[PDB]
């Protein structure tokens, strides 16, 4: 059944999920437009961790002897301390990582931080590391602008939908949102310089890769996602070889049938 029920469904060139009529089913395959294949469990560091740790890790204040980047990291470090026009970028960045937090904590209440997402950034850097034999001793050479102003310019090229209007170029920001959070998370000034001493080279590379490795994870207009989805479920429904409620195969049967008289009706009230 599952199969006969979704044959006709596939991802159409506009990046919508429709059947044989034209009826939209998903306006973006998987609420994100990514081909399941290109996805891995990553961690949204921004979420978990005391309000304390957060600061000590993502906070940068160029107007303070103890909350600034020690020049032992940035080439133009000593000549930054105090600069007021930077502290605004630096502060924008933080009032954002901050928004990200709340946002995430509004979506994933559990506090669970590990989720499937496109482009494995953890590893994308790991390579950058030993690919330029980055030494943890000497300092970087990134302008604070270099960083914060490229991370932004990055998000700009992570296109899923391409439309030439608003209603479309707006769904865009959406289908990406979750990703960027992870993104802004891993490419935060402090981090970028204190944890993984990237040079400008390393960075500009880490950036190129992400963009293209992302544009690869998109979903190909052609995939017959309907059938797929079906199988993906029915399949593991065959490997099912069998705390006191209707559970499993007989259940799944119930569900699909939209049965009114379920053996177990339960209901949890908090």
């Amino acid at each position: 059944r599952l199969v006969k029920a979704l044959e006709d469904i596939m991802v159409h060139y506009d990046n919508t999920t429709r059947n044989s009529l034209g009826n939209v089913i998903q306006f973006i395959y998987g609420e994100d437009g990514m081909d399941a294949a290109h996805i891995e469990k990553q961690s949204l560091d921004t979420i978990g961790g005391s309000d304390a740790a957060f600061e000590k890790r993502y906070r940068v204040d160029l107007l303070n002897t103890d909350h600034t980047l020690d020049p032992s990291l940035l080439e133009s470090g000593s000549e930054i301390l105090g600069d007021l026009k930077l502290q605004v970028l630096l502060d924008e960045e933080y009032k954002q990582l901050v928004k990200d937090r709340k946002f995430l904590r509004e979506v994933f209440v559990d506090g669970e931080a590990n989720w499937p997402l496109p482009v494995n950034i953890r590893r994308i850097i790991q390579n950058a590391q030993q690919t330029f034999h980055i030494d943890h001793t000497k300092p970087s050479d990134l302008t604070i602008k270099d960083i914060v102003l490229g991370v932004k310019d990055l998000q700009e090229n992570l296109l899923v939908l391409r439309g030439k209007n608003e209603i479309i170029q707006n769904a865009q920001r959406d289908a990406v949102t979750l990703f960027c959070c992870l993104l802004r998370s891993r490419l935060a000034t402090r981090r970028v310089l204190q944890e993984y001493r990237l040079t400008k080279q390393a960075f500009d590379w880490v950036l190129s890769n992400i963009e293209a490795q992302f544009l690869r994870s998109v979903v190909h207009p052609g995939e017959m996602v309907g059938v797929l989805a079906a199988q993906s479920i029915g399949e593991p429904a065959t490997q099912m070889t069998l705390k006191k409620v209707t559970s499993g195969v007989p259940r799944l049967k119930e569900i699909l049938n939209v049965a009114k008289n379920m053996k177990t009706p339960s209901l949890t009230v908090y």
């Binding site: 006969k4 044989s20 989805a229």
Partner: protein, 112 residues
């Protein structure tokens, strides 16, 4: 909210076995079962009554019964359905066939 439940429930039927399935799939299904209006069942009594052409619903549980009432009310079939084409021996609009390929005679000159 219902969808959110239908999904949630279904998800629990696959997790209770320690197996993992990527959202998107159960999502899609849960969605198919819900767009239309309320709760459309994955059964002969539901999704097999929808505006989908005849020949497609033909290939499932009511066959002749469904065909009969097709010439009766003179239905028209788009032949946009997977099944449809399969029955005709035609290349269906699926992956490899979600488009057409042409010989641009123009570019077929600068190539020499």
């Amino acid at each position: 909210a219902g969808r959110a439940a239908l999904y949630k429930e279904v998800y629990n039927v696959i997790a209770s076995d320690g197996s993992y399935v990527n959202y998107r799939h159960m999502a899609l299904l849960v969605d198919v079962m819900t767009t239309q209006g309320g709760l459309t069942s994955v059964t002969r009594h539901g999704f097999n009554r929808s505006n989908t052409g005849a020949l497609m619903r033909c290939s499932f549980e009511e066959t002749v019964e469904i065909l009969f009432e097709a010439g009766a009310s003179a239905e028209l079939d788009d032949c946009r359905g997977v099944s449809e084409n399969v029955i005709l021996g035609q290349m269906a609009p699926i992956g490899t066939g979600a488009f057409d390929v042409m010989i641009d005679e123009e570019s077929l000159v600068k190539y020499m």
